[PDB]
Design an enzyme around this catalytic site. Structure first.
Site, mmCIF file in Angstrom:
data_model
loop_
_atom_site.group_PDB
_atom_site.id
_atom_site.type_symbol
_atom_site.label_atom_id
_atom_site.label_comp_id
_atom_site.label_asym_id
_atom_site.label_seq_id
_atom_site.Cartn_x
_atom_site.Cartn_y
_atom_site.Cartn_z
ATOM 1 N N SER A 49 0.774 -1.232 0.000
ATOM 2 C CA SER A 49 0.000 0.000 0.000
ATOM 3 C C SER A 49 0.823 1.310 0.000
ATOM 4 C CB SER A 49 -1.006 0.010 1.190
ATOM 5 O OG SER A 49 -1.875 -1.115 1.202
ATOM 6 N N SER A 91 -6.070 2.931 3.854
ATOM 7 C CA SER A 91 -5.455 2.016 2.886
ATOM 8 C C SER A 91 -6.484 1.176 2.160
ATOM 9 C CB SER A 91 -4.387 1.130 3.530
ATOM 10 O OG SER A 91 -3.250 1.879 3.811
HETATM 11 C C1 LIG Z 1 -1.606 -2.319 1.719
HETATM 12 O O1 LIG Z 1 -0.461 -2.763 2.013
HETATM 13 C C2 LIG Z 1 -2.804 -3.193 1.976
HETATM 14 N N1 LIG Z 1 -2.463 -4.603 2.139
HETATM 15 C C3 LIG Z 1 -3.095 -5.583 1.481
HETATM 16 O O2 LIG Z 1 -3.996 -5.363 0.699
HETATM 17 C C4 LIG Z 1 -2.706 -6.981 1.672
HETATM 18 N N2 LIG Z 1 -3.239 -7.724 2.549
HETATM 19 O O3 LIG Z 1 -4.146 -7.373 3.344
HETATM 20 C C5 LIG Z 1 -5.254 -8.258 3.522
HETATM 21 C C6 LIG Z 1 -1.673 -7.554 0.787
HETATM 22 C C7 LIG Z 1 -0.905 -6.788 -0.084
HETATM 23 S S1 LIG Z 1 0.228 -7.710 -1.013
HETATM 24 C C8 LIG Z 1 -0.399 -9.101 -0.188
HETATM 25 N N3 LIG Z 1 0.078 -10.348 -0.438
HETATM 26 N N4 LIG Z 1 -1.373 -8.882 0.714
HETATM 27 C C9 LIG Z 1 -3.555 -2.663 3.186
HETATM 28 N N5 LIG Z 1 -2.581 -2.509 4.261
HETATM 29 C C10 LIG Z 1 -2.910 -2.102 5.415
HETATM 30 C C11 LIG Z 1 -1.844 -1.561 6.256
HETATM 31 O O4 LIG Z 1 -2.087 -0.869 7.266
HETATM 32 O O5 LIG Z 1 -0.672 -1.822 5.951
HETATM 33 C C12 LIG Z 1 -4.317 -2.242 5.821
HETATM 34 C C13 LIG Z 1 -4.964 -1.320 6.526
HETATM 35 C C14 LIG Z 1 -5.052 -3.487 5.381
HETATM 36 S S2 LIG Z 1 -4.855 -3.788 3.645
#
Ligand SMILES: *C(=O)[C@@H](NC(=O)/C(=N\OC)c1csc(N)n1)[C@@H]1N=C(C(=O)O)C(=C)CS1
Length: 238
Positions: A49, A91
């Site tokens: 993100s 995010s």
């Molecule tokens: C951003 O990093 C985003 N993360 C995700 O969407 C992922 N998993 O969450 C379920 C992901 C990205 S690549 C992968 N294999 N999985 C959002 N990140 C945050 C954060 O605080 O870092 C969130 C609030 C939840 S989702």
């Protein structure tokens, strides 16, 4: 100058949590490395993100959205109408995926290559290249990017950069402001956690940071912010 900073205390902060991590700090013409796994600073990881900062820049610059647009899921917290700035704070991946599809693959690849973000590879899927690859970036590259954003030195309009900076304010106290963006790539073989941003001191001085660590599913998301604030206080940056 890239150098290990002298800090026994920050190394112990990472050790206590049974994780491998690095904190990269950029001031002036110096990058300092802290933590218990300094080799991570030159290792490539998906931005997850953290890419939302560059996605927002490209979308605003190319007039694919604006800061007042209301965009009408994995988390119930995402299941609502919100602005690009609110999506930044939460995010909200689906809002950023919608923006990426509007930008389109041709423009996105052209812009990421022009900026030179990380390996600058986006492949063929415009809506997930920053989450699952092939786009990868080092913590040093991330601190350099965010330091340029903070100083309005990226190759985008000044107003667009100011608008994206304003979406990133995380905390403030005693006149110090902390801007940044988290990321976490979960459900992979080694989970990566990011917190990349900058401190604006009362006189306007900027200290940029990139925290990069191995995450576990048992951790609270807020562990990134907690470790960052403890570390910044220890370094007298706040
Ligand atoms: C951003 O990093 C985003 N993360 C995700 O969407 C992922 N998993 O969450 C379920 C992901 C990205 S690549 C992968 N294999 N999985 C959002 N990140 C945050 C954060 O605080 O870092 C969130 C609030 C939840 S989702």
């Amino acid at each position: 100058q890239i150098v290990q900073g002298h800090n026994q205390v920050i190394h112990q902060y990472f050790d206590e949590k049974n994780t491998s991590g690095v904190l990269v700090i950029q001031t002036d013409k110096k990058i300092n490395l802290y933590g218990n796994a300094l080799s991570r600073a030159n290792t490539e990881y998906v931005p997850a993100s953290t890419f939302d900062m560059l996605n927002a820049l490209i979308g605003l610059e190319n007039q694919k959205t604006d800061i007042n647009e209301i965009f009408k899921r994995l988390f119930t917290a995402w299941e609502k109408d919100m602005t690009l700035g609110e999506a930044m704070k939460l995010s909200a991946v689906p809002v950023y995926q919608e923006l990426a599809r509007r930008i389109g693959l041709d423009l996105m690849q052209k812009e990421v290559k022009r900026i030179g973000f990380g390996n600058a590879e986006i492949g063929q899927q415009v809506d997930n290249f920053w989450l699952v690859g092939p786009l990868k970036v080092t913590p040093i590259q991330e601190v350099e990017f965010v330091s340029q954003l903070a100083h309005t030195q990226l190759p985008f309009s000044e107003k667009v950069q100011a608008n994206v900076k304003n979406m990133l304010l995380l905390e403030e106290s005693n006149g110090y402001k902390i801007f940044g963006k988290t990321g976490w790539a979960m459900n992979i073989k080694s989970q990566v956690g990011w917190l990349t941003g900058w401190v604006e001191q009362p006189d306007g001085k900027i200290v940029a940071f990139a925290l990069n660590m191995e995450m576990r599913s048992e951790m609270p998301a807020s562990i990134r912010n907690e470790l960052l604030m403890k570390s910044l206080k220890q370094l007298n940056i706040i």
